[PDB]
């Protein structure tokens, strides 16, 4: 049930998991929680999400609490600023160190507690 989009396959889970158990699931399927590196990828993801909430590969790194991608895609603070839901990230409760796709809009991301369970999206490159 992997969906193909521009050189990558994506798995939209049917079962919710915490961020890290989701990541571990992805890794077991030779993938990672998805990165988002273009407007078109963001659009494919939120449209496919169909208004439900999915963990993506957004998580905190370094002592400064910079956002990063678990698949090691360099996180571009400038090119991504427009992908957060207006008002996010807010570190609500100072315990929101992971990111999900939440709104069906280009401004789609919310930061949420890593230990909360949601559906999730794995991403796997097609290697011919
Ligand atoms: C834990 C979490 O997702 N917090 C975000 C928060 O979401 C909450 C729900 O968890 C709660 O059950 O319902 C209220 C509305 O009734 C919120 O949707 O919402 C915050 C703002 O949207 C967000 O910043 C939190 O991270
Ligand atoms: Ca938040």
Author numbering: 198 to 325
From the reporting publication:
Langerin, a C-type lectin on Langerhans cells, mediates carbohydrate-dependent uptake of pathogens in the first step of antigen presentation to the adaptive immune system. The extracellular portion of langerin contains a C-type carbohydrate recognition domain (CRD)2 that binds sugars and a neck region that mediates formation of trimers stabilized by a coiled-coil of α-helices. As in other C-type lectins, the CRD of langerin contains a primary Ca2+-dependent sugar-binding site where Ca2+ forms direct coordination bonds with two vicinal hydroxyl groups of a monosaccharide. Langerin binds to a diverse set of glycan ligands including high mannose structures, β-glucans, and fucosylated blood group antigens.
A version of the truncated, trimeric langerin mimicking the naturally occurring minor allele with Asn-288 mutated to aspartate and Lys-313 changed to isoleucine (langerin-D288/I313) was created and compared with the form with only the K313I change (langerin-I313) and wild type langerin. To determine the molecular basis for the enhanced binding of GlcNAc-terminated glycans caused by the K313I change, crystal structures of the carbohydrate recognition domains of langerin-I313, langerin-D288/I313, and wild type langerin in complex with GlcNAc, α-Me-GlcNAc, and two GlcNAc-terminated trisaccharides (GlcNAcβ1-3Galβ1-4Glcβ-CH2CH2N3 (TR54) and GlcNAcβ1-3Galβ1-4GlcNAcβ-CH2CH2N3 (TR55)), representing the terminal portions of poly N-acetyllactosamine chains that are ligands for langerin detected on the glycan array, were solved. Because several of the structures show the same interactions, to simplify presentation of the results, only the data sets that gave the highest resolution structures are shown: wild type langerin CRD bound to α-Me-GlcNAc and trisaccharide TR54, langerin-I313 CRD bound to α-Me-GlcNAc and trisaccharide TR54, and langerin-D288/I313 CRD bound to α-Me-GlcNAc, α-Me-Man and trisaccharide TR55. Structures of the double mutant, with Asp-288 as well as Ile-313, with α-Me-GlcNAc, and with the extended GlcNAc-containing oligosaccharides, showed exactly the same pattern of interactions of the N-acetyl group as were observed for the Ile-313 mutation alone. Thus, the differences in the interactions of Lys-313 and Ile-313 described for the single site mutant can account for the enhanced binding of GlcNAc to the naturally occurring Asp-288/Ile-313 variant as compared with the wild type CRD. However, in all the observed orientations, there are hydrogen bonds between the subterminal galactose residue and the side chain of Lys-299. These contacts would not be affected by the variations at positions 288 or 313. The K313I polymorphism is tightly linked to another SNP that results in the change N288D, which reduces affinity for glycan ligands by destabilizing the Ca2+-binding site.
